[PDB]
Design a protein around this ligand. Structure first.
Ligand code: MGD
Ligand code: MGD
Ligand code: FES
Lengths: 843, 132, 843, 132
């Protein structure tokens, strides 16, 4: 086991500088503070000599505010000087109440420190491919090159020859400043159509279904998970992936601790400890923790067949409607009352690829969705009794005939699962039918992934469906690719093929560049463009580390991330905070919004020099000198309620921030919105929610059924608690990499014995899409025939075995993946030290 | 004084321990609870003739709840937020919320069977220095 | 400026474990000790509590043994546990007398430490190109792939299809164990002809001239530098490149501190403080320090025209011979008297490419070399007076008629300089003529680079001249390349062209591998071989870090270096020492000798499986389990006096070791040889040394005269004091990279003004061979038109502008390079913190 | 304490410094020689109205010879083994044998012009703790 051998830590002194910090990482947006103080000072164990006013010569008790782990301490540059830093979770933040996950608690230790040698992989200088290798250079040189090639390609072939891949998310590697900066560059200065998002290969919404119905996906508050009678958790492994939401809000409900709260806010109705329905093919640690906290009788784990959620929800909707377990007044008052006729190709297809499902009235939707319990039990593999029980935990009135309060929460098991549009809609149908939107203890919400921080110009020009960018690239189209804060080599679908082609096309441009004179920049530009005209690709990567896709790029531009800059984002409750900068960017690294502005400025210069003065003038409006300038040009001018929000006002509100949208500013507080749709007026032109007539149609995405039928195992995929995303930071964190040097593939021990595998064996997963590697981890809770591989991982990429298959709106169907498995090596010595024991807590 | 000065403290005698049953202990002072545990197989940090005696903090490095030991499993388990630690692999967090593997004692068995502790390999929950 | 902010260091306690350590790095082989102790223990300031017996609560005085700098402290794994380590220079070692250079003194800080996060770039696992990226794997998998491909290729195309590049040197990355392991594999088990050495592109000697004359190049001892009347230092920048030899032995001669000892060991002649002739086109810090110590009157800096050494030496030899300042008895007794005939193509060409110069008697060599003072002044640019003065300082008898004692020392300014074979012989003529070999105060020696630790089977099959391997590779020949401990991307000649072609050929194999199924290992091997047959190359890298050339390789195998293994080598005086292992190899890394043995075993297994049992059997004799087994099989059985030497015996001798060859073992002491040739019997069949008739013939290597004529600046090249080699460790050492983020190019400040360059400007150096970059460093001591670029450096590789020109024996003529210079960028912001002040100490 | 406790020691008054002439001081005790130096141009670690006052150890971090100051170059120069340090650039070793750039004082000027030292950024030659 990895052990730091750090025996003591510097003590935060009483006069340390305090900074408000939201967690860099997941959607929960846990509150923290960063305390910094000079390198040659320290605090003392006496109360007056430390930030806590506690005597630190004594053992603190459980849940103390007056302790931090070594992963919470570092030394960092701040205004050119080394300072101590502690980044510690905030006890007074209502999101986390002082909980810090395994990820957030390592913010300090995954910061850049020269003094303590952490994250020495961080990028410090612009890099250009020249003289046969990547070489460091100045900003002026690298941006000049990027702009010259970009401007020439776009002037000769149009903006369609510019391909963009960029984050659209919040938190570190995103945020309002940074989504605005990039958005303004590509959607205001230009009209880039061939743009994709960091997690999906087209410029689309993950949840077109709920949005078209009039229900924005983040409509409740985290208190609603405390107040619900029943939590319905679909395709979420919340303990691992929305950890402190689960621990600080769901668990109190399951344990009965929120009963006093429920009784106070909701006096005219009965209350019991929360029950929870978990819809996931796999038994997770989240299932286990629910059982241990609530008791097995209060947890309904519906272990459906992969990809059959839509059948379950349509049966539940059918049963609840037929029992009349619905909110008749909500339906009459708030939902669309005149249904409309099915499109001609229904039920197999919608009116076009833009509209895979049919929006209508409650009654029409019930008849369109109609599916018996027995049919749903066949498709899902669930027992009829389990489905009936679930309908009861959702719809059946409480004693006195009071409405059951149900929070419906869903994440990537649904969004990246079968038939995204219809399955999203079918779940929303349930919440609408039961009046569980805009009221306490309700919601039909994304549980989320990253924090959210999106503000951009109109994307009307991208179309719907939008372009399938990876398929353009694989097919030899496009000329220049700008990549901002995503690494398709680890995380795209059909990743093996993507990599083969990307390498070849970028190699053309590299071979041309190594043979041309650099000091003659016009010759270099011309040689690059000739290679592009032959089918090559010129690629520019904006990131904070050397990425996998970066190994194919020609220019690398170093970014500064959250904490090295000021940054705004909102959590899964819409709670907007300001993370206040507490350290300096490594080397010459620069916030993404400012990269974008500098690139715009360079585009203006070069286009002017080329004589296209009208095109050049489109790149104005980027005189920003600090990230607050982008905040003010973006969020402050364009968000609803934006006038009310400034960095100074956000700062005054601390880690609790306010819930968007802002409705006013009075007495130093931004006034927010605790829940959406409280008046029952929905996000449609007439104010009514629509239901969705959304019949089951099997595995919707191309090739999926054939993939299932022709391979041995389900290769389910997703997150581990210990790993953040593609391990971009974690790869230089021994605590993480000592635990999993390879990605795990959870396998049932009988399956392993049948395939001749032993624990720790390195195995190849393969199918029609490609091949990859993983380490067999024996998992007694896995069902026979069903495996789970950690996604996004640099030492074995799961996406290599995902097909190119998407829905009509170009949503990637990563979860429905099947393949074969065969041994590559006996368990290597570098996994001899690992525990292969169960991840489930035992009381 | 560059490093922490750990006291060498007698915790028990080899004789006192039974296979797979923790014995409560405290190191490096009375306020830092932990256990000796004889595991029946040679393991990392394990002392005695069989190299199977380990000592660990039993206070969770996440938020400080006390860890229970499952004999069936030979794991430590946290009722706070469901962490699991493997004392047969150096206290590796099998799954959990701590950013630390379980602090493990550096043990020495004296010529008479007495078991001394003279260091710990990680920062014990609730102290900013392991020797207070 | 970089500052570690380490305010105190753990104290080595009295009971720490002591290990003998030779410096990893240069030829001088300074002695150190590694003291290790448990991570949870420490010393104290009382004498009883520390390894020094001193009260460390008191300030120490200059030159104290009881101190170490932060770069000498780390925490490392030893036998699986974290231990403190201090690696500090040995006061008692006669080589260094407690001096530690800027490189040696950072051995600890550049060791691998998970606890203190140093050198996290170190390789821990075998890596194989598969699934679109490099992936970690087991030794069994990686070795099997390497062997199957290698065996298939060799079986189908012969051993000539296998190309090898390997270290031949001592110290870290070499040594007797490692050179034996690799040599037994390629020269015993196989007869690989297409092999090159880490610093030159064929399997030749650097100094065939002196060797053919009978004068092995390491013939003296370091005391001789203290004892000479005159040191002649040719093409060496000893203060920076042989630092502690210079400081601990040359300096005391120049200062007159050695006078007492001179008088003592050689009474019967007069003695003055040593004088020094430095033959170097550039004024270096070495020249400066010499003036500062001896007075400018005792330093003669012959700032010759680049490449004109041979003309200077022939004029010296002619002048000294004509005056009769020669040791006539030595000439008569110990040198060739045979008459001979010049070969037919003399003087332009020798008898063949194998023999560029003509070996002869004293008298025939004088007539053949004959050059007037006036002709040599014209060629070299020196004044006639300077050449006459040098002749006097070398040959003029002292006050009794007593022979003047002269140490001739030479390094890469000669060896990588013009007409290596003739120039080497011409300098050796001077030492032969003056009887300054095998006597106190004499020698004609390499000053050296790496330590030495060569023992291998016969290389007779390679030929002479041997194959020019880079030209084979660049010309599309060969199939598989094994690369051991060298990085041609940074350090070969004509490196731009090399990188271009190397990338293309290896990419062909990458593209095949990415598209074939790895889990069917036979299909993978076939896809590889097919790609090889089409002109590709399969490349395997054995190294300790991810290298530049490693970015083109298909398999990477992780080595353990000195200190993580036991290792033997000798220094520039033939002082052989054992470095005693004090830490563990990182991860699954393995000593090179054991990698070679495991690869031999795999080759045996694989060839047996293919049915070539006779060939398989050639790979026996590699049952080694530890590096000492390779020492016993190689050095102990094959070196002269090897039977006297074992690990246990070397260990007892300490950092003083003994001088090779060993002549016996008595009283626990390996007995050795202080100087070679003390009896006048030389390394030829008749025991007579030969002179060389070596006439001046201009710039010998092809293209060099044209390169010079058609470009504006000399691009001289070489070392910096602070930087070790290609910065393989240093690139993750902030002290080094904070000083020089780009390689410097030293430029005369008027040349800078005339080219519009300022300090710190990023400039492109370019010519017919290629282009590269460097940072302009104003250097008032540079001559106009003469620049000097740091070689080998990853952020701007000087080799890119070296032509493919070699002499007849394939010695690369790196020093004679000319090119143009133009600005790439104004000084980048990442060099704003740099001092650009003179590197010369001021009194 | 986890870190070294530096004393805040008064070294001189700004009025005592003449441009480009070192003033001998000692910090953090009387056996650790150093200088204050006013450079006439704002520089790294420089204090005072013009940001041009610096303090350095004048004992060579290689083998402890005392450094001389060249006023024409503004460098420290070591007669031991030819090392050169640049006080206009944070004590950067321009060329030399130390593995450390020159230990520099963390300085503070008080309202009366008194210059205080409260830290040092490298390990001073000949002590294993900067505060003995
Ligand atoms: N520790 C950690 N937490 C994270 C992240 C991280 O990298 N690490 N990343 C964040 C991001 S960006 C995101 S998007 C979120 C993702 O959060 P989640 O969606 O909670 O996490 P996943 O592991 O992708 O998948 C959740 C579950 O979907 C299940 N599943 C698979 N197929 C199906 C199906 O057909 N139907 C149903 N109903 N379930 C199915 C899987 O078995 C799995 O347990 O997590 C965020 N949180
Ligand atoms: N700091 C440090 N020391 C090292 C090394 C290191 O990387 N760093 N590497 C080691 C190795 S492997 C080696 S081989 C040695 C090399 O040691 P040296 O040979 O001393 O070092 P170089 O800097 O290559 O070249 C020395 C001198 O040759 C001069 N020179 C250039 N052209 C000519 C010429 O035509 N004639 C003459 N006479 N001189 C010329 C240069 O101006 C330069 O000052 O150093 C070793 N020591
Ligand atoms: S206190 Fe142990 S898991 Fe949180």
């Amino acid at each position: 086991a990895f052990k730091r051998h750090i025996d003591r830590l510097p003590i935060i002194p009483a006069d340390a500088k305090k900074h408000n910090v939201t967690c860099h990482f997941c959607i929960v947006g846990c509150g923290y503070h960063a305390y910094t103080w000079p390198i040659n000072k320290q605090g003392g164990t006496d109360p007056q000599n430390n930030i806590f006013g506690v005597d630190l010569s004594e053992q603190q008790q459980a849940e103390s505010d007056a302790w931090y782990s070594p992963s919470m301490y570092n030394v960092v540059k701040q205004d050119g000087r080394d300072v101590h830093v502690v980044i510690k979770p905030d006890h007074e933040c209502v999101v986390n109440s002082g909980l810090g996950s395994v990820r957030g608690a390592r913010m300090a230790e995954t910061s850049f420190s020269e003094a303590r040698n952490t994250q020495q992989q961080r990028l410090t200088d612009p890099l250009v491919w020249r003289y046969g290798q990547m070489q460091p250079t100045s900003w002026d040189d690298a941006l000049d090159l990027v702009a010259r090639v970009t401007a020439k390609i776009v002037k000769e072939k149009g903006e369609d020859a510019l391909i963009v891949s960029a984050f659209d998310h919040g938190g570190a590697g995103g945020g309002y400043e940074n989504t605005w900066g990039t958005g303004k560059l590509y959607f205001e200065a230009m009209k880039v159509k061939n743009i994709r998002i960091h997690n999906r290969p087209a410029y689309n919404s993950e949840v077109h279904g709920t949005r078209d119905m009039g229900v924005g996906e983040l409509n409740n508050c985290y208190e609603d998970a405390e107040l619900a009678d029943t939590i319905v958790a679909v395709g979420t492994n919340a303990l691992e992936t929305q950890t402190n939401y689960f621990l600080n809000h769901w668990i109190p409900n399951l344990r009965g601790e929120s009963l006093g709260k429920k009784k106070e806010l909701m006096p005219e109705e009965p209350h019991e400890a929360g029950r929870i329905i978990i819809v996931d093919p796999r038994r997770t640690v989240t299932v286990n923790a629910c059982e241990q906290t609530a008791g097995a009788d209060n947890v309904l784990h519906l272990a459906i067949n992969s990809g059959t959620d839509l059948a379950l929800f349509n049966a539940l909707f059918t049963y609840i409607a037929d029992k009349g377990w619905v909110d008749r007044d909500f339906i009459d008052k708030s939902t669309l009352r005149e249904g409309t006729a099915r499109p001609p190709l229904y039920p197999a297809r919608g009116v076009s690829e833009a509209n895979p499902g049919h929006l209508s009235s409650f009654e029409d939707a019930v008849e369109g969705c109609r599916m018996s319990i027995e049919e749903a039990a066949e498709i899902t593999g669930l027992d009829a009794a389990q489905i009936i029980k679930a309908a009861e935990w959702i719809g059946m009135p409480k004693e006195g005939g009071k409405r059951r309060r149900v929070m419906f929460g869903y994440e990537k098991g649904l969004i990246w699962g079968n038939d995204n549009y219809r399955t999203n809609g079918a779940l929303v149908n349930l919440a609408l039918a039961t009046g569980n939107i805009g009221r306490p203890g309700g919601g039909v919400v994304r549980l989320g992934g990253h924090q959210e921080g999106y503000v951009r110009p109109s994307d009307a020009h991208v179309g719907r469906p939008a372009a399938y960018v990876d398929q353009l690239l694989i097919g030899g189209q496009g000329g220049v690719h700008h990549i901002w804060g995503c690494d398709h080599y680890k995380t795209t679908l059909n990743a093996h093929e993507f990599k083969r082609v990307y390498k070849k096309r970028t190699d053309m441009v590299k071979d041309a560049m190594s043979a041309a004179p650099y000091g003659d920049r016009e010759a270099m530009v011309n040689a690059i463009v000739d290679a592009i005209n032959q089918g090559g690709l010129f690629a520019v990567n904006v990131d904070i580390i050397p990425t996998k896709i970066g190994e194919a790029c020609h220019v690398i531009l170093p970014a500064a991330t959250s904490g090295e800059m000021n940054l705004t984002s909102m959590n899964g409750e819409r709670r907007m905070r300001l993370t206040e900068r507490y350290m300096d960017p490594p080397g010459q690294s620069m916030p993404d919004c400012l990269i974008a502005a500098r690139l715009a400025n360079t585009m203006e210069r070069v286009l002017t020099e080329m004589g296209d003065v009208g095109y050049a003038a489109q790149f104005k409006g980027f005189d920003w000198q600090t990230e607050e300038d982008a905040f003010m040009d973006g969020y402050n001018k364009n968000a609803h309620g934006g006038e009310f929000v400034t960095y100074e006002r956000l700062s005054a509100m601390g880690t609790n921030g306010f819930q968007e949208p802002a409705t006013g500013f009075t007495d130093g507080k931004i006034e927010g919105t605790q829940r959406l749709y409280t008046d029952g007026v929905f996000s449609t032109d007439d104010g009514k929610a629509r239901f969705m007539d959304a019949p089951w149609r099997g595995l919707q995405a191309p090739g999926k059924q054939q993939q299932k039928d022709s391979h041995k195992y389900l290769i389910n995929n997703g997150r581990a608690n210990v790993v953040w995303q593609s391990a971009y930071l974690d790869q230089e964190n021994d605590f993480v990499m000592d635990r999993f040097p390879y990605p795990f593939i959870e396998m049932n021990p009988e399956d392993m014995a049948e395939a001749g595998l032993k624990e720790g064996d390195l195995v190849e997963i393969y199918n029609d899409a490609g091949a990859t590697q993983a380490m067999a981890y024996p998992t007694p809770t896995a069902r026979r025939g069903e495996t789970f591989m950690l996604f996004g991982f640099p030492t074995g990429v799961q996406g290599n075995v995902t097909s190119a298959g998407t829905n009509e709106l170009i949503i990637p169907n990563y979860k429905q993946t099947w393949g074969n498995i065969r041994k590559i090596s006996d368990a290597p010595r570098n996994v001899a030290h690992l525990s292969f024991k169960s991840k489930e807590y035992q009381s | 004084a560059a490093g922490v000065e750990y006291p060498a403290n007698r915790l028990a005698n080899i004789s006192e321990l039974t296979l797979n049953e923790p014995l409560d202990v405290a190191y490096p002072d009375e306020d830092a609870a932990g256990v000796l545990l004889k595991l029946g197989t040679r393991v990392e940090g394990g002392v005695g003739p069989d190299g199977d005696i380990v000592g660990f903090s039993t206070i969770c490095p996440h938020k400080g709840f006390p860890l229970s030991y499952s004999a069936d499993n030979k794991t430590f388990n946290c009722p706070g937020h469901f962490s699991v630690f493997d004392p047969e692999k150096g206290g590796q967090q099998v799954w959990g919320q701590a950013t630390q593997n379980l602090p493990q004692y550096v043990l020495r068995v004296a010529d008479n069977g007495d078991i001394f502790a003279e260091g710990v390999d990680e920062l014990i929950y609730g102290r900013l220095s392991n020797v207070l």
